[PDB]
Amino acid sequence: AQNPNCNIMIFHPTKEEFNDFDKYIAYMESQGAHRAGLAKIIPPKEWKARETYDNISEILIATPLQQVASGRAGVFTQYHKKKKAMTVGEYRHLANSKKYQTPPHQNFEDLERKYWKNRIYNSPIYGADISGSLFDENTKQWNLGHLGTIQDLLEKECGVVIEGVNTPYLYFGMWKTTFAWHTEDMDLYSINYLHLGEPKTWYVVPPEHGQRLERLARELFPGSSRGCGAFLRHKVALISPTVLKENGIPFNRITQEAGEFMVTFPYGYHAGFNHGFNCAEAINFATPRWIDYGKMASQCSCGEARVTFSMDAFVRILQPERYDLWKRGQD
C-alpha cells in the first residue's frame, strides 16, 4: 500500500505532465497521496495563472464576514458576523492596518504558535465564498474555471443527467482568518490555488481516520452534537493541534505559499488559517473514486448547513433515502 503513514505529499509536475488534469490526479493517487487527505502541487516553472494581479482592487466583497470566536484557545467555535460591503482595495488596506496586520514573528512555526495562543482574542474579517475567477482565460493548464464539472462526471460514470453547475470561488484573507474543520459538500474533492499574498497553513486528518475526529468533536462540542448528527457541516468548530495530539487524533500540517495548489481528497477533514492578506481560488471536483464517498457522505438536516443549488441533485441521485429529510432541512 502506498503512503501507509498518510503523509502529505508534494508534487512537482513538469509542463508536460500539467496538461491532463484528471490523469495527474489519478497519478498522485497511484502514489498514495489521497491517504493524507491533502496534497500540494507546485506548478511547473513555465506556468502562470495570469499575467499580473495589478488590477484586483476593484473586485467587491459584498458580505465580508467578521469571525468572532467563543471557547478556549484550543477548542472554540466561530460565528460569522456580516459586515458592510467593501472593495478588495479597501479590504487589503484594512488587513494591513495596525489592528489587523500580521505581528512580528521569527518564522512560520512562531507564527503558528501565536495563532493558536491568540486567535480567540481577535475577530479578523474574511472575504469568503465570492463567485468568480482570477485565472486568465488563456491559461489552459489547471485553470480552475475550466475543469470538467461534477455533473458531467456523474453522467459519465452513472449515466444520469442532472441540473446544476460547478463554478469557482474567491477567498480574500487576512491574519487569523480561519477555516473551520470540515470535509467538502458531499465529501467531494477540492482544489485551491493561492493566487497572491501571504501563506495559508492547513491541518488535515487522513480520510481513513475521519471518524476519530468526528468522535472527538462530539465530545468537545456536546450541545452542538445533540443538535445535529453532522454538525461539522456547519463549518464553525476549531480544534488545535495540541488538542488533537492530546487526544491521539492522527493529523498532518503544511503551509501553502502563493503560486501553489492544494488538493483535498474525499472525506479529508481540513482546517487552517491565513498568515496575512491573501487571495485564494477554490472549487470542488469529482473523479470516479469519489462516487462511493458521495453515496456515504453525512448530511446536516438541522437546517444550519444550507448549501448550493447543485447539491440537491447529488443527494437526490446518490442518497435517495436521505433526500426527503435533507430537503426539509434546506427548505
Ligand SMILES: O=C(O)CNC(=O)C(=O)O
Ligand atoms: O481557503 C479557505 O478559506 C478554505 N478552503 C477550503 O476549505 C478548500 O479549498 O477546500
Ligand SMILES: [Mg+2]
Ligand atoms: Mg479590479
Ligand code: NI
Ligand atoms: Ni475545504
Ligand SMILES: [Zn+2]
Ligand atoms: Zn446541522
